[PDB]
């Protein structure tokens, strides 16, 4: 997995690849690593797929209840604090590595959370197996005062570095742009540079090829 | 002593044009020893079909657990659970046992009764959801099934064609795995009819 976060003047952008693996086998060629904690707080997850999804949904649920209780739009630091306290409690046994980003009344924010419960602040971050490929691109091209269109380009370029050079990462690039004073736009399959080429042959079998012992109608109704 | 490969077995699910197919082998063994050639791994709660590979005691336990949960669901909701919702229930239930998991590879298949959309999904033992347009594979011959499905499969197959494709995918994958085979079952699922076919395959 390759996930990045990039800050620009009026917001923050997070991107991710779409490959899920079971050992050396690709389980999902187009899985979604970008999770909505709250409408304007989004999360990118690497590590144990279930752990990143479960911890994202739990804090997302508690943040919604907190938002309704306080009659206030949720803050990134709240999601960050609740996540890192939960992850610390389980002493790294919940294998969730997350880039938490969003806009709130306080402004735009970008954090990373490691499974043991450490948090980092930055203008650009990368996590996962392809983080070193991505961080190489970020360290080469990142500058202060990026525009929206520049930050999307930099973020997607950093993911592509992971897709091509890291065996853990591949397929497509998902992006989410969180700009201040605007609705967050989730760009599912923003880039699809790994389309499967036309097969040489159709393997559609002549009907009756498979040998059958028994047939029966199944009753699904009451 | 690897729970997922004591009993052995495989499940595969595919989508066609306004139809889904789910298929499984019939073997239950104790490592090398074949014990039962009647052990079905596909169950159904209304119009939602669930295949489960892995440790056979957990296959049985989870079937009994989901029957229990879908029965209470129907009594309270006054309607049959839909595939998308059941998928979420499976995921919740597996992750509840995060640090003591069921050693299983479940596969949900069925057609949403409202939208008429074909739906399939797979899970790891910890409850992570693997949603797919094309096909889901599970079991001791998952590598073999991935190879067969990825080559044989094409989109928008008619029920009668889809039957041939899934059957050949399962049979040829099972014959390259020691712990899988000993008979097979294929469910062809249309909007309001379901055909169940037992395949003739080599018995070694």
């Amino acid at each position: 997995t390759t996930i990045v976060g990039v800050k620009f003047n009026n917001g923050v952008v997070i991107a991710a690849d779409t490959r899920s693996t079971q050992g050396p086998i690709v389980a999902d060629k187009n899985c979604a690593k970008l999770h909505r904690i709250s409408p304007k707080i989004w999360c990118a997850g690497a590590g144990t797929a279930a752990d990143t999804e479960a911890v994202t949904q739990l804090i997302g649920s508690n943040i919604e209840l907190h938002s309704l209780y306080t009659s206030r739009e949720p803050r990134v630091v709240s999601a960050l604090q609740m996540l890192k306290q939960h992850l610390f409690k389980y002493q790294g046994h919940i294998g969730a590595y997350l880039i938490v980003a969003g806009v709130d009344p306080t402004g735009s924010h970008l954090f990373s959370i490691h499974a043991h419960g450490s948090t980092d602040v930055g203008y650009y971050l990368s996590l996962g197996s392809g983080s070193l490929a991505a961080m190489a691109v970020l360290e080469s091209h990142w500058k202060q005062d990026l525009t929206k269109e520049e930050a999307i380009k930099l973020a997607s370029d950093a993911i592509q570095a992971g897709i091509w050079n890291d065996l853990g990462s591949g397929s497509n690039v998902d992006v989410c742009v969180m700009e201040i004073g605007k609705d967050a736009e989730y760009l599912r399959n923003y880039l699809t540079p790994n389309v499967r080429e036309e097969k040489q042959k159709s393997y559609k079998f002549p009907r009756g090829t498979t040998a059958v012992l028994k047939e029966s109608i199944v009753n699904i109704c009451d | 002593s690897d729970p997922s490969s004591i009993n052995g077995g495989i499940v595969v699910a595919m989508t066609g044009k306004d139809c889904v197919a789910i298929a499984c082998d019939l073997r239950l063994g104790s490592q090398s020893l074949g014990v039962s050639n009647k052990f079905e791994k596909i169950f159904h709660y209304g119009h939602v079909f669930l295949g489960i590979t892995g440790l056979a005691t957990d296959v049985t336990t989870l079937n009994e657990m989901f029957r229990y949960k879908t029965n209470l669901y129907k009594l309270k909701e006054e309607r049959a659970i839909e595939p998308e919702t059941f998928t979420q229930l499976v995921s919740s239930s597996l992750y509840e046992r995060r640090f003591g998991p069921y050693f299983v590879g479940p596969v949900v298949a069925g057609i949403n009764s409202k939208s008429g959309k074909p739906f399939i999904a797979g899970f790891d033992l910890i409850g992570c959801i693997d949603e797919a347009k094309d096909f889901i594979v599970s079991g001791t011959a998952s590598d073999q099934l991935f190879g067969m499905c990825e080559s044989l499969y094409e989109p928008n197959l008619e029920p009668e064609d889809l039957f041939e494709t899934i059957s050949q995918a399962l049979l040829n994958a099972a014959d390259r795995d020691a712990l899988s085979g000993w008979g097979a079952v294929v469910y062809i699922i249309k909007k309001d009819e379901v055909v169940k076919r037992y395949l003739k395959m080599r018995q070694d």
Binding site: T1, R19, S20, T21, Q22, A27, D28, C31, K33, G45, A46, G47, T48, A49, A50, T52, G128, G168 | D124, L125, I126, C128, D130
Partner: peptide, 4 residues
């Protein structure tokens, strides 16, 4: 497990 499935990793990302």
């Amino acid at each position: 497990f499935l990793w990302x």
